[PDB]
Design a protein around this ligand. Structure first.
Ligand SMILES: O=C(c1ccccc1)c1ccc(O)c(O)c1
Ligand SMILES: O=C(c1ccccc1)c1ccc(O)c(O)c1
Ligand SMILES: [Ca+2]
Lengths: 241, 241
């Protein structure tokens, strides 16, 4: 019954992680867009002093999201939010109950954060070579149960953590979005279509097919347009070897 | 009941986190050193295919650590391990029960991993400027309850996550260890002694005073020698501006 407000942006996969979890929770919550990259409201640092999206307020008196109460708890960092939601809504079974399975969920998330996420940001925002990113994705793909299903077996917050980035990768590639080079983009599109990456394609499809995804995605074409407003995605800039 | 073997190195702060947590659990567990950087046993990828320390085996038959059994669960990534130990050992209260307090533990861990750890690695291993690391450390300091106590109030795994790195910073500094410049080392030495960093010094003292720390620390002098066996701490190499 305590209110949940999530500060978001359509383009952001970090915000997207938490929307997905909140859906799978059957939670009652508010979203409120913030143009964090070009025109941050003056009050935002009151919900997140790091000036990053997502941000979350919890509890306090019901207020307009742009008039945040100093009495709500201010919760930062998307993976902290996913664990918080799981904690709040235990009947939703957002993590398994078995600790080894819970540890598969947690291990999967740290593999994404520590070895994959930095390669996405680097290939896309700096044009660094794609090969290490393909290697990190092959490594992450091997963590999945190879006969089907989600990271921990049943769906968990670990699948919320990773799908925003993977589901963005395909339509961004088809749209030539990113600073990497044409050579590397052909290389990425060929690899993500080859058999090497069949398992991960299944995983993207499986996650995409859940309502939590469909209800938090504006559409492939719409998301590409949202991503275009991202400065560092300097439209028509490419870096070479 | 089921066995826990943790593959470690004295130098490694990531391994150190799991030792601290296992102590606070009152867990029965085995440690087995692995010279991961110079001479990795060729069985080691059976416990961790990423070839990193720490690695953990859980359950299966009692075997010698260097004859790991295919039937034990293989758990990777230190923060997944900390969450796993909290799960296994709930009477130990390694996390609070209140969700918002639990979210402060998780937020604190993400703040360290996302804004602080990369700056330690870069100042120390690449000689990059100290300033962003001091700024990140100031931000992390502000997340602490300023009146005293640990990240989430009571001690939690979030404190295991962070103290191996902070407790190393001070004696490594005094020992002139790292690739950063002399100027930068004087700068970090002064900054970490000034009143700006009073709170974090008390947090380091608070954490160090627990048995979990003392029983997992070889001694300041010993740990500095252990750190010297690290290639990327190539003694007598320094980078400037
Ligand atoms: O959307 C992405 C992304 C990048 C590459 C592939 C797929 C998605 C992204 C956006 C903001 C970030 O700060 C970031 O690290 C990543
Ligand atoms: O020991 C440290 C360290 C570095 C700087 C200050 C204090 C401790 C370390 C060791 C291996 C790593 O991979 C790493 O990122 C960090
Ligand atoms: Ca596998």
């Amino acid at each position: 019954t305590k209110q949940i407000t999530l500060y978001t942006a359509t383009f952001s996969p970090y915000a997207h992680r938490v929307r997905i979890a909140l859906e799978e929770a059957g939670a009652e919550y508010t979203t409120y867009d913030v143009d964090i990259l070009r025109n941050m409201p003056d009050w935002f640092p009151l919900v997140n002093p790091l000036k990053k999206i997502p941000a979350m307020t919890f509890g306090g008196p019901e207020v307009p999201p742009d008039q945040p109460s100093p009495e709500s708890a201010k919760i930062a960092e998307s993976l902290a939010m996913l664990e918080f939601i799981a904690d709040l809504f235990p009947d939703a079974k957002l993590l398994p109950t078995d600790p080894v399975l819970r540890a598969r969920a947690r291990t999967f998330m740290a593999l994404y954060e520590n070895y994959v996420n930095g390669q996405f940001r680097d290939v896309w925002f700096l044009g660094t070579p794609a090969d290490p990113l393909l290697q990190a994705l092959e490594m992450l793909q091997g963590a999945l149960p190879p006969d089907g299903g989600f990271a921990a077996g049943e769906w968990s917050i670990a699948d919320a953590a990773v799908i925003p980035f993977l589901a963005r990768m395909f339509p961004y590639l088809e749209a030539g979005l990113g600073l990497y080079s044409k050579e590397d983009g052909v290389k990425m599109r060929k690899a993500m279509a080859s058999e090497r990456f069949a398992r991960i394609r299944q995983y993207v499809r499986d996650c995409r097919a859940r309502p939590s995804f469909a209800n938090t995605w504006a559409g492939d074409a719409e998301q590409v347009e949202a991503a275009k407003t991202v400065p560092m995605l300097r439209v028509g800039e490419h870096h070479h070897h």
